[PDB]
Symmetry: D2
Subunit: 31 residues, 4 copies
């Protein structure tokens, strides 16, 4: 995989993805 950037103009919507990102990233840390 590579490094991708998701620039979102706003604030609330950015938080929404931030949540789906906290869980997904949590799966990689799962152990």
């Amino acid at each position: 995989g590579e490094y991708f950037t998701l620039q979102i103009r706003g604030r609330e919507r950015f938080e929404m993805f931030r949540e789906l990102n906290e869980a997904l990233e949590l799966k990689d840390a799962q152990a």
Copy 2:
């Protein structure tokens, strides 16, 4: 919290949410 239903008409989009759902639910199972 209560039980909510997200009926999505399609197939690919439903999978997208299915992923964000696999991680979030994984956080509740984390331990």
Copy 3:
């Protein structure tokens, strides 16, 4: 496509997906 159900146990997380669902569904209504 068919009809799928996304049952999420909680309330805030359900809203998150609800937003991504309002826009996607908005694309289908776009015209």
Copy 4:
């Protein structure tokens, strides 16, 4: 609102958010 960046390490997950981003951004273009 301001400009936020969502750097996700991977490729498929980045696409998932890319979809929820295509619709949300589509709502701002709706008119």
